[PDB]
Structures are given as structure tokens and as C-alpha cells.
A paper describes a structure:
[name] was predicted to contain three domains, namely Per-Arnt-Sim (PAS), diguanylate cyclase (DGC), and phosphodiesterase (PDE) domains. BDSF binding to [name] was previously shown to trigger its PDE activity, decreasing the intracellular concentration of c-di-GMP and favoring biofilm dispersal.
We observed that the undescribed region of [name] (residues 1–117) was highly conserved among all [name] homologues. Indeed, we found that a construct containing the first 95 residues of RpfRCt (RpfRCt) was soluble and well folded, as determined by size exclusion chromatography. We determined the X-ray crystal structure of the RpfRCt(1–95) to a resolution of 1.2 Å using the single-wavelength anomalous dispersion (SAD) method. RpfRCt(1–95) adopts a Profilin-like fold consisting of an N-terminal α-helix and a central six-stranded antiparallel β-sheet with a single α-helix connecting β3 to β4. Distance-matrix alignment (DALI) and PDBeFold searches of the Protein Data Bank (PDB) show the closest RpfRCt(1–95) structural homologues to be PAS, Ca2+channels-chemotaxis receptors (Cache), and cyclic GMP-specific phosphodiesterase-adenylyl cyclase-FhlA (GAF) domains; however, canonical PAS domains contain five-stranded β-sheets, and Cache domains are periplasmic domain proteins that contain an additional N-terminal α-helix that extends through the membrane. Like RpfRCt(1–95), GAF domains contain six-stranded antiparallel β-sheets; however, unlike GAF domain proteins, RpfRCt(1–95) does not possess a pair of interacting α-helices below its β-sheet. Consistent with the fact that RpfRCt(1–95) is neither a PAS, Cache, or GAF domain, protein BLAST (BLASTP) searches using the RpfRCt(1–95) and RpfRBc(1–94) amino acid sequences return neither PAS, Cache, nor GAF domain proteins. Based on the above structural and sequence analysis, we conclude that while the [name] N-terminal domain is structurally similar to PAS, Cache, and GAF domains, it is a new domain with a Profilin-like fold. As detailed below, this [name] domain binds to and negatively regulates [name]; thus, we refer to it as the [name] interaction (FI) domain.
Residue numbers in the entry: 1 to 95
The structure:
Amino acid sequence: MKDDLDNNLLYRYCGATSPFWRLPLDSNALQLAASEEAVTSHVVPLTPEQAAQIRTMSVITSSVTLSLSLFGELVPVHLVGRKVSRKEWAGTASA
């Protein structure tokens, strides 16, 4: 099992070890929020292919792992979630 004391670059970047994420149908900016009520706006600009990969998720929960560049370092980010509405995907992330 991963050691929970391993430095977590999501925590350093957006303020949560397991942030909530959202990806719309009209933008390739991945939103990372420390809470579902948070008002700030940490984003990761996904490439078109990365965003298309998230959008293969259906309305049933599944997982996709993306290699995101945080602080110039490639971090495997594990996105669990689903298509939550006609035009939005959302879930929780870990890293």
C-alpha cells in the first residue's frame, strides 16, 4: 500500500490529497477543488487526448489514470468518477 506520508502533489497544488474533479463538455480545463463547495479555481489544462480519455467514462463509476504535469513533474493521477450529467464528468482524484 502507498505510504500516506509520501508527498502528494495534488495536496501541494490544490489543497487536498483527494480533490474533487470536474471536466465539462465545453472545456478541456480539469477543475480540482479541495471541497465540493470550494469557491477557488485550481485547474489543470488537459491535452485534447487526455480530455477525450476522461470523456470515455460513462454514467457508471469507473477509473482513468492520467499523467499530469504538476510543478513540472509527471504525476500519475487516478480519477474515479463518471458522467454525472449530459455535459459534465466528475469524481474524486488521488495521487
